Amino acid sequence: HPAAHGVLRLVLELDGETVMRADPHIGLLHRGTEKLIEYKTYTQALPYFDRLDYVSMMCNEQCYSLAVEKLLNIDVPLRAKYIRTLFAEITRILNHIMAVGTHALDVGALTPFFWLFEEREKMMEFYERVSGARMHAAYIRPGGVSLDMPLGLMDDIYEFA
Amino acid sequence: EPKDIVEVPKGYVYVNNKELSMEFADITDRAASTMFFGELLRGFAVTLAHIFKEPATINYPFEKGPLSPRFRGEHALRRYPSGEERCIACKLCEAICPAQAITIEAEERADGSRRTTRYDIDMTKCIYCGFCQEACPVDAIVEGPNFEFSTETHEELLYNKEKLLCNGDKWESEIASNLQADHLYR
Amino acid sequence: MIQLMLYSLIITTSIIFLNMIHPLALGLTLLIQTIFVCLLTGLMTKSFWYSYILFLIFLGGMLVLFIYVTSLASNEMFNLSMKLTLFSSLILIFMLILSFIMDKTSSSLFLMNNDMQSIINMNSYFMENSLSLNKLYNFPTNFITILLMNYLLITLIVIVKITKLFKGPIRMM
Amino acid sequence: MFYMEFILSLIGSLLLIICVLVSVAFLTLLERKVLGYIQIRKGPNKVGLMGIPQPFCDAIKLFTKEQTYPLLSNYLSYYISPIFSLFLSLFVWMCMPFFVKLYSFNLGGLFFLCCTSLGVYTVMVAGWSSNSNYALLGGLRAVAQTISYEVSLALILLSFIFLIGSYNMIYFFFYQVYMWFLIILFPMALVWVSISLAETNRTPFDFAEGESELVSGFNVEYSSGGFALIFMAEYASILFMSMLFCVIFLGCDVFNLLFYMKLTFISFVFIWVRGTLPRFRYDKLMYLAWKCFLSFSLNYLLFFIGFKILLFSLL
Amino acid sequence: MFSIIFIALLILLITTIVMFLASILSKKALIDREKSSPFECGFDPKSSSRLPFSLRFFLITIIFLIFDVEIALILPMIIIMKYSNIMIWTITSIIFILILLIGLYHEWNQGMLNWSN
Amino acid sequence: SLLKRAWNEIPDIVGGSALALAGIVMATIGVANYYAKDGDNRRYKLGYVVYRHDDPRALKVRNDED
Amino acid sequence: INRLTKLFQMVREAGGLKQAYLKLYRNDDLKIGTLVGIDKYGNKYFENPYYFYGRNRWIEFAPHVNM
Amino acid sequence: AKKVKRDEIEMRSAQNVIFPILVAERDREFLRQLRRNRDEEAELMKNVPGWEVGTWYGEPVFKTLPEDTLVTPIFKEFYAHSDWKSYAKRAHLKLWS
Amino acid sequence: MWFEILPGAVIITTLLSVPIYAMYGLDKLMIGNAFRRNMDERFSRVMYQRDFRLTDNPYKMNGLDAIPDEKTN
């Protein structure tokens, strides 16, 4: 069903159109992620978190990166913090567009999906321009981000904003 | 303006806090829109306005991109300007590959140089993470610019060394240009 | 001429209608016949105004009973009756044969169509339905219409009281 | 002479039939281009030359694709419902006014009311015949639509009828010679479009299809042949109902060229709205028809009963 | 009429030919036990569609039958306005529409127009 | 008050009833005006109406200009 | 209001309506640009900053390919 | 509304100048037909036991009417001696076949 | 770039206008008269019978030339 996002299986108990009981059968996308991680080095496990919450890409890395840092008991440089925080917000702006964009389609409105996914396309150029991938950047890492921003990116980040 | 039902502290913004006025000046204003489709009117002006904009579509394949030099795509084994393959079968790429998509078997070459007799990438298992090109100490393996290599058979997506080497020659000019413009960051 | 063929079809559809069991089979039979009767009535009248009204009225009743059929008699069965198909098809062609070899000046109904009226009839040159529907809204017969109004409104009070909406939906428990 | 007359009537219907059937093909393209431009997209542009032959390029596919024989469906009903859906869509065009006579149709306004109501059974039977949960919900979602718009539709037609004096559509031309009834009937024009959407089951009243609530509504179990006719029958309804708006509120100069410039524009409006509004909630429509529209429409019968009475005294 | 019936049949024949072309022009492949299974989002169905489907607008459903039969009595109005007595026509018509409104507002206020809850 | 509540809750029934009330008013003007002109006797008659000069109706022929 | 003057120009470099139509039929668009260069295989590369960023640089495939 | 009424009255006034003309024509042909039917009835039923022209076996179909009181017969009876084609040519002009 | 819509609207506008502009053409070519008689009112139908009887073609007009010019008196 299109609104189910291809994963959910609501076994509804319909008394006409009104729902009396809803059973969200989950697990159609269980890929034993947490068991594979037990077999992979910490660095090899970083990409797994891009996949979890796949619309908030760089936000999941940050959670993983912060966790490892607390155990490693290290601190990140001042510049890397701002790059992280900047890209946490860009990810947040991306994600809410998907939520607003997707939610509108479920209701039925179409144009907000396209008017916003045009901006979403511009935003994922910044992911592509720093990490090399439009999605699943694998950019945030426990020691801080993996590369400096390209020269002249920040001008284009301003231009979008 | 109407008042707020709940007083707001500092550093917080409310979305539905303002109450509804009950003055005839305002009720009629709400009534007029509710009665002549006033709210929907401006909604129709906006959508019509978008008719008069250049659409943002790109005429692919004649026009395409844009990308950046850091783009991760199809793989390729480079070689030195002499022609000798760069890869020395160090196997760092195999050990770091999150997907275990790389298989390497190495043997003492006839001339006695450490080299691979086997180098296979299972493109249906790779995730294009790019850890292989970061770990290679001699830049032997790179993710080339190509992203247009869809096939019609599963078997054709399993690259062996000869296929990888061919890409490293077809794409040599562009890879050498990306590395030069990007190595300092890396 | 088609009047006789309309006679045959209305007869044919009525024979099968006696033999329907499935409620929707009844409904389809009834819907088809409501078309013919509506068509036939306008042949013997100065206008088809009433066929339009009758057709519109019954279609309202057609939908509603499907809604209840689909809630009460949803799970039922059809059975093609080779006896029925042959019998109707047998008589149908038989009846159609007669209508070709019938003295169909004799079979035509004596009721005066609009054209059947004389040329001198001055009252036949007005709007198609002016006079006929006229005294529905003139003294004294207008009060009958008024009487319906209460009757219809009073009916509208009867259904809600019989129905007792608040005590739940309807299911075929 | 008379023998010849009815020959011409056949030609007109066939000519009107093929022309309407062709237009609904090109309307579907227009829907995709316009809806592709309200959205900042480009729309179909590659196939053939500049996308114009796109709808024909789709009519090939929907007919070279196999019929579906559902396991649990009453096949004969499932197989016939597309026919009557398309037939009723084309048949209602014979009442469209022509000054070059096609059909007299005194009481033409009623003939509209009868035909449009019939369009619900085809959806209704198709959904129930398919014998799928979604299809049945689509069918019963369509029937509930009729319970809402049907009554208010007649009353609003009656208001327009009071202005002209008869149910013959031709008289709309004479009374709209100096001006357009849009001015006198602005809220009804706005209301009438709203009900017109329900007739054709379009966003914001798209419940029979019910896309993204039901997977595809009552069409969920149709395929190559049946689904195509269901589709064409859908867009024939839009085209006619758009025309019926042009004869009522926009002059009704059927022999003038501009009337057809107007006709396409109202067709654009129907696409325009689909790209603006979200779908209503299944109950909010039925409440809307009975709580607001029905009360609204009755209020102006008094306004037009008084106005006609007042005008009758002067004239 | 008789003209319309003929074209009504002629159209029905034409539309009928369309699928009769589609049924032959359609690609033909062996039907599978799963190809003809119903569509219910890819998981087998628990419940036949022919179970009793509960109803909540039943009350409105009945009121719909009524309100139409008063549409049979308003429609003739126009046709007989030039020909009728104006007092009788005026009075009766008004007390026709007031009766309808009063009936509607009465039920609306009683909450019958709301669905079963 | 009452006026405010409805005007805030169901403004259409107020505006609609406002024009409905207009109908009754200007229906009461037109109907009274109709018998203020003796409009039962209409100068143009449907059909071919011919009276004898001595018939009572022949006196009541409405005499107009055009 | 004055795009026709551009439109006529596109025809002239195209080589008349006959070659203009084949261009439209092939590339699905008519655009003005300066020939940046020609590759070994005949593809001609154009550029015009007038258009927006994505459509700024485009390529004409070799004639012999044709679809 | 004035202009529509203006035009309508003009159309109706044209009828009242043509309507008397047709009535004159119809009467002079309606009567002529009646003689033929009264003559066709005589020839058709020479040998019937007790048939009298214009009555059901001698029973007048109107007892109260004054003498020589002409009564327009039924449409069907007017066409009692005619093919179906002529009948349908007038009764179905509205429907057009 | 809003031009690309117009090719869609031109076709629909033309196709829908073919019928009325075709019958106006066919009737002239095949009746001799642009419009066909309107059987909307009894009087129209009545006279239509009259024309169909006299000329044996309702759309062929009988001008004054049908009148017997002279009477010998």
Ligand SMILES: COC1=C(OC)C(=O)C(C/C=C(\C)CC/C=C(\C)CC/C=C(\C)CC/C=C(\C)CC/C=C(\C)CC/C=C(/C)CC/C=C(\C)CC/C=C(\C)CCC=C(C)C)=C(C)C1=O
């Ligand atoms: C990703 O997010 C999104 C979604 O979420 C899933 C959406 O749902 C959506 C949903 C989008 C929509 C609902 C758009 C509206 C589209 C649809 C509902 C259906 C898609 C189909 C179309 C648009 C095509 C329109 C046309 C049809 C379906 C077929 C209609 C029938 C047609 C055209 C035939 C007309 C008949 C004719 C006689 C015309 C003239 C002649 C022909 C066709 C004959 C053809 C050829 C021959 C006879 C061969 C002869 C050969 C020889 C003699 C040699 C969007 C946009 C989205 O972005």
Ligand code: SF4
């Ligand atoms: S890109 Fe990542 S997953 Fe793919 S081969 Fe290289 S290291 Fe392995």
Ligand code: SF4
């Ligand atoms: S890391 Fe580089 S040198 Fe080492 S085995 Fe891999 S490709 Fe060869």
